[PDB]
Amino acid sequence: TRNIPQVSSALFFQYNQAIKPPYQVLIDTNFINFSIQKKVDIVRGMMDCLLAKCNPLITDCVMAELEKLGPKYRIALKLARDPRIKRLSCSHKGTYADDCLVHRVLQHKCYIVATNDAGLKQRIRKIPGIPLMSVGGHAYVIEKLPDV
């Protein structure tokens, strides 16, 4: 049987009419450094960037990467376990975080992706209606979220 995946009902051409405040945002592992490195707090750099209440989300795969890092990145590990950061369970064998994040956004058009990886960012860019959050300069920046 042939498969033609149905484009999500949350999408009108290129604008997602479903993503709305309070936003749910997936945290990428590299985001934590450029947050710590820039002295930008996770919860509120998001609020300042998006001017809304933001619910950060750490999946098992991104989490699984973090402890593998080791003592050098303990600060990143502890901030990941801040109780304000909710946890997402995963039911796929692989621990590669980039693939897991790309799948979740493919599945449901309700997440913001917080990452600075060029390769991952390009993959998310191809997927329509996925707001992409990044940290540059002094604070966070959101590109595909016109409600801003």
Partner: protein
Amino acid sequence: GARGGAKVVIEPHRHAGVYIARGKEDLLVTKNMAPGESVYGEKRISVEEPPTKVEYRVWNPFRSKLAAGIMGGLDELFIAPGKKVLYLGAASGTSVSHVSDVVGPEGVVYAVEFSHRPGRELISMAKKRPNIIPIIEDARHPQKYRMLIGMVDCVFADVAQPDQARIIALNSHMFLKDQGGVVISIKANCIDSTVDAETVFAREVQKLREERIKPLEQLTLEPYERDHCIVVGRYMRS
């Protein structure tokens, strides 16, 4: 459209136990376990076979949330002939009787319902169809009717309840076989009307993952119904 005296060509559908009636319009149909009657007034197709007159029932996507699902093209349906199925939220025989058609004589349908008044007709329908076992009981406490049900190959939940995830897990934990079938009908308005539909579906998928059900597929049910998706998963005990 499909008038009384019209002649149609019946052909099988990709899923076993589901047949397609062709014509100027196409009707997706199921063989009648109890020929000669309609359960909710549905149109019936009769075919002469060597000659016995086998009957078929039309299967309205605007009435059964399952039916709109197959119209949308679900990849995998655990509901198949000669399989045990556990139907939750069996308000009446509108959809159960058709699920009974697919499973056939060899399988059975465990129809679970709570509210007494719709249950009465479910009992009445169960009389014509030997293979349904209606269980007028609140699904939130599967301990009550553990007596009546063994293992089940697939569990279907059409329950419109905000805590519908919990009911599925408890029922699946008891009677669903390892690697069994899970097919859920979700209405976000009943669960959380404050947030948008897509947020709700992601949340429901999450709770299923917490309960050791691996989701396999989900599909939006438009244009037949609003804010509805059917999630298909497999119960992975280990």
